[PDB]
């Protein structure tokens, strides 16, 4: 084909490639223009899902896509780490937390999800893939009055997260250090899977073994042009589950939210 | 997975099996409940595009899918033939035309397409694959005041369509007997491709040779659960074209309309 977005993406990737050659370590302030250029493409409403995969999954875009998707994850992780450290240091922690680049977005995303998953105060939720800034976990308790365990595989990241939660004075959020297998030993009404929790195939196979058919499972994925940001969850990833609802994003939200139940 | 639609589709297909390879022999009036059954499924808005794809792409669904598709194409063709003769014989041809089962649907589909393609009075349209009842051709003129050539490969079908057009007294619609290659000798502003024009690969490869980069080309295809009805136009078919816009259907409309331009 001949899409103008193909050259734009290749030029972005080239810039990312040159940057990474020079520095392993992300300069979070400096690369905010690159993120906004990438998000303008991802957010372009005038483009349907089929057209999105025609442009994105074209073989000649694979290298550029990989670089962009690596950027997004690395930037996200560094933004979370920096903000976590900021919150811990702050004498005004909630003010510092609301300044996080994605804060307004998670706010909208959760509201969407709570409707999709019928969240009720008092229910037990497990969130897989907390990261250093366990924003979803925190909101689930602070806003939705849920009883939350956040699971984090990396012990130092998990420790930082506990410090964030304590700095915010948020009750009812516990952090578990380990992989998604810790869910066998937990009771929960709802289970959420972070957008960047990996590997997807393994994570869904572990969910499948350790849940029953009545437990609500909500995962975060990417669709349409927003798949420039990250690889979506594949239908093969969700073998043995049935999709029972979706919330497609709008505005600046990047994630699609999917409700599934284990078969059968 | 365990979608309820899976079993429902297999059940409907079981009742089509005994018509296999002789669907053209269908009783049109007596099979309408069967179309309603398939349509209840195609038009279900709660089924997301990923779920629809899980179903239609599964190897186990392949024979039931061919049975449903053979049923839908044969029913549509028979109805078209039956209505064309009915119009020709009618004292009230316009009213008879409007009693066509898909009439209300085509009217909305065209409405959508006219916005998408920016149709205007006096513009030159060519419609590939007229069939016996060239409704789109007739409406492009009768409603949109466009000047139309309808292309029909089968000489006896072309002859019948001309009778339908002459019976209605509609201006500015001519039928050319031939393949899509006849566009070589034509001048036009908008090219439309019928949902049923086949084989898509040969057709689009010929269209590519004869149009330019500013020709508006609209084709009809199937997306989501509506792809149960007929094989969608593939990525491979529209090589050398770029998508510029899409109208997704709602209500009982079956076709997705897609606007393309030749590269660049
Ligand atoms: Br979807």
Beta carbons of B134 and B175 less than 8 angstroms apart? yes
CA–CA dist B154, B8 (Å, integer): 37
Residues in chain B, overall count: 264
Run of H or E residues at B257? strand B256-262
Tallying the residues shown for chain A, one arrives at 264
Distance CA A48, CA A213 (A): 33
Spatial neighbors of B30 by CB under 8 A, at least 6 apart, are none
Q: If we measure between CA atoms, which residue out of A134, A13, A136 comes closest to residue A67?
A: A13
Q: Which residue of A has its CA nearest to B51?
A: A243
Interface of chain B against chain A, CB under 8 Å?
A: 1-3, 46, 48-51, 53-54, 223, 235, 239-243, 245-246, 248, 263-264
Compute the Cα dihedral for A206, A210, A214, A220 and give only its sign. negative
CB burial of B93-123 (b: ≥16 within 10 Å; e: otherwise) equals beebbeebebeebbeebbbbbbebbebeeeb
DSSP annotation of B172: S
Determine contact, residues B112/B144, Cβ cutoff 8 Å.
no
Chain A residues touching residue B54 (CB < 8 angstroms): 235, 243
The residues near A111 (Cβ < 8 Å, ≥ 6 apart) are none
Calculate the dihedral angle through the C-alpha atoms of B164, B167, B170, B172, rounding to the nearest 10 degrees: 60
Chain A residue with the nearest C-alpha to that of B221: A50
Return the structure tokens found at B216.
């508006």
Q: Which residue has the tokens 């816009």?
A: B245
**B115: enclosing H helix or E strand:** helix B103-117
Question: What is the Cα gyration radius of chain B?
Answer: 18
Contact B129, B193 (CB under 8 A): yes
Nearest-Cα distance to chain B for A247, in Å, is 10
Residue ranges of the annotated binding site of B for L-glutamate are 106, 136
Residues in Cβ contact with B143 at an 8 Å cutoff, skipping those fewer than 6 apart: B110
Q: How many CB atoms lie within 10 A of CB B37?
A: 16
Give every CB contact of residue A42 below 8 A, 6+ residues apart in sequence: A225, A226, A228, A229, A254
Task: Check: CB of residue A228 under 8 Å from CB of residue A65.
Answer: yes
Strands laid side by side in the B173-177 sheet: B173-177, B147-152, B124-128, B190-193, B216-221, B256-262, B241-247
- All residues of chain B having their beta carbon less than 8 Å from the beta carbon of residue A50 are 223, 243, 246
Q: Which residues pair with B148 in a beta bridge?
A: B125, B173
Distance CA B242, CA B180 (A): 20
- To what resolution in angstroms was this structure determined? 2.0
Q: What 3-state DSSP class applies to B262?
A: strand
Q: CA-nearest residue of chain B to A233?
A: B50
CA distances to B123, B167, B188 from B146, rounded to whole Å, are: 5, 19, 11
Give the rounded distance of the alpha carbon of A253 from its chain centre: 11
* Other beta carbons less than 10 A from residue A210's beta carbon: 17
Count Cα neighbours of A104 within 13 Å in the Cβ-side half-sphere.
6
A152 annotated binding-site participant: yes
Residue A151: strand pairing partners: A128, A176
Q: How far, CA to CA in Å, does B145 sit from each of A145, B114, B148, B216?
A: 61, 12, 9, 17
Cis peptide before A264 (omega within 30 of 0): yes
Question: Is residue B243 reached through a cis peptide bond, with omega within 30 degrees of 0 on the bond before it?
Answer: no
Cis before residue A199, ω within 30 degrees of 0?
Answer: yes
Beta strands in B129-255 (DSSP E): 147-152, 173-177, 190-193, 216-221, 241-247
Q: What CATH number did the domain enclosing A145 receive?
A: 3.40.50.150
User: Among partner residues B53, B241, B248, which is closest to A235 by beta-carbon distance?
Assistant: B53
Considering only CB atoms, B263 lies closest to which of A2, A48, A49, namely A2
Q: Which helix (H) or strand (E) holds B109?
A: helix B103-117
3-state secondary structure chain A: CCCHHHHHHHHHHHHHHHHHHHCCCCCCCCCHHHHHHHHHHHCCCCCCHHHHHHHHCCHHHHHHHHHHHHHHHHHHHHHHHHHHHHHHHCCCHHHHHHCCCCHHHHHHHHHHHHHHCCCCCCCEEEEECCCCCCHHHHHHHHCCCCEEEEEECCHHHHHHHHHHHHHCCCCCEEEEECCHHHHHHCCCCEEEECCCCCCHHHHHHHHHHHCCCCCEEEEEECCHHHHHCCCCCCCCCCCCEEEEEEECCCCCCCCEEEEEEECC
Separation of alpha carbons A99 and A89, rounded Å: 14
Positive or negative, the Cα torsion across B187, B193, B197, B200?
Answer: positive
Bridge partners of B10, per DSSP, are none
B241-247 and B256-262 beta bridge pairing: antiparallel
Q: Is the peptide bond before B199 cis (omega within 30 degrees of 0)?
A: yes
User: Whose CA is closest to B143, among B187, B102, B175, B98?
Assistant: B98
User: Shortest Cα distance from A240 to chain B (angstroms)?
Assistant: 5
Partner-chain contact A48 B2, CB within 8 Å: no
Assigned token pair, B118: 């920016």
Q: Please give the tally of structural domains in chain A.
A: 1
Helix H, strand E, coil C: the string for B9-57 is HHHHHHCCHHHCCCHHHCCCCCCHHHHHHHHHHHCCCCCCHHHHHHHHC
Ligand 1 geometric centre to CA of A96 (Å): 35
Contact A264 B53 (CB under 8 A): no
> For residue B91, what are the contacts with CB-CB under 8 A and spacing of at least 6?
none
Q: Which residue of A5, A7, A47, A48 is the best one to mutate when testing the B interface, meaning the one whose CB has the most B CBs within 10 A?
A: A48
Residue A128's closest CA among A214, A190, A213, A209? A190
Q: Which residue of A has its CA nearest to B55?
A: A235
Ligand 1 center to residue A57 CA distance, Å? 16
Q: Could you say which of A1, A51, A246 has the minimum Cβ distance to residue B246?
A: A51
Cα angle B223, A117, A147 (rounded to 5 degrees) comes to: 150
CB half-sphere exposure, A196, CA atoms < 13 A: 19
Q: Taking Cα atoms as reference points, which of B143, B148, B161 lies closest to residue B106?
A: B143
Q: Which of A3, A54, A263 sits opposite B1 (nearest CB)?
A: A263
Q: Domain range spanning residue B44? A: 1-264
- Give the tokens for residue B27: 């009783």
Q: What is the 3-state secondary structure (H, E, C) of A117-158?
A: CCCCCCCEEEEECCCCCCHHHHHHHHCCCCEEEEEECCHHHH
Task: Please judge whether B2 and A239 are an interchain contact, meaning their C-beta atoms are less than 8 angstroms apart.
Answer: no
Q: Give the angle B155-B139-B25 at the CA atoms, nearest 5°.
A: 45
Give the CA radius of gyration of chain A. Answer: 18
Residue pairs between chains A and B whose CB atoms are closer than 8 Å: 40
Task: Tell me the helix, strand and coil percentages in chain B, rounded to 5.
Answer: 50, 15, 35
A240 and B50 within 8 Å at the Cβ level: the answer is no
Integer Cα distance of A28 and A34 in angstroms: 10
Q: How was this structure determined?
A: X-ray
Cα separation, B198 vs B181, in Å, equals 13
Q: Would the CB atoms of B263 and A235 count as touching at under 8 Å?
A: no
Q: What's the gap in Å between A94 CA and the centre of ligand 1?
A: 34
Q: Which residues pair with B149 in a beta bridge?
A: B126, B174
Structure token pair of residue A58: 């074209």
């Amino acid at each position: 084909s001949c899409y103008i977005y193909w050259d734009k993406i290749k030029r972005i990737a080239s810039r990312l490639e040159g940057m990474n050659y020079h520095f392993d370590e992300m300069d979070t302030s400096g690369v905010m223009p690159l993120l906004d250029e990438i998000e303008e493409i991802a957010h372009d409403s005038t483009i349907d899902f089929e057209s999105a995969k025609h442009i994105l999954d074209d073989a000649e875009m694979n290298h550029a896509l990989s670089l962009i998707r690596k950027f997004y994850v690395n930037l996200g992780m560094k933004l979370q780490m920096e903000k976590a450290q900021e919150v811990i240091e702050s004498d005004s922690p909630w003010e510092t937390l609301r300044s996080f680049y994605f804060y307004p977005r998670y706010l909208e995303l959760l509201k969407n999800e709570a409707a999709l998953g019928r969240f009720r105060r008092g229910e037990r939720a497990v969130f897989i893939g907390g990261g250093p800034l366990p924003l979803t976990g925190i909101l689930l308790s602070h806003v939705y009055g849920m009883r939350v365990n956040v699971v984090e595989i990396e012990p130092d990241i998990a420790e930082l997260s506990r410090k964030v939660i304590e700095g915010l004075g948020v009750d009812g959020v516990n952090v578990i250090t380990g992989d998604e297998t810790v869910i066998d030993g937990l009771e929960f009404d709802v289970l959420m899977v972070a957008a960047l929790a990996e590997p997807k195939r393994r994570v869904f196979r572990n969910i499948h073994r350790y849940v029953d058919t009545e437990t609500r499972i909500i995962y975060r994925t990417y669709t349409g042009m927003r798949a420039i940001l990250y690889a979506p969850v594949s239908d093969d990833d969700i073998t043995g589950f049935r999709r029972a609802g979706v919330v497609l994003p709008s505005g600046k939200v990047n994630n699609t939210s999917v409700l599934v139940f284990k078969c059968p």
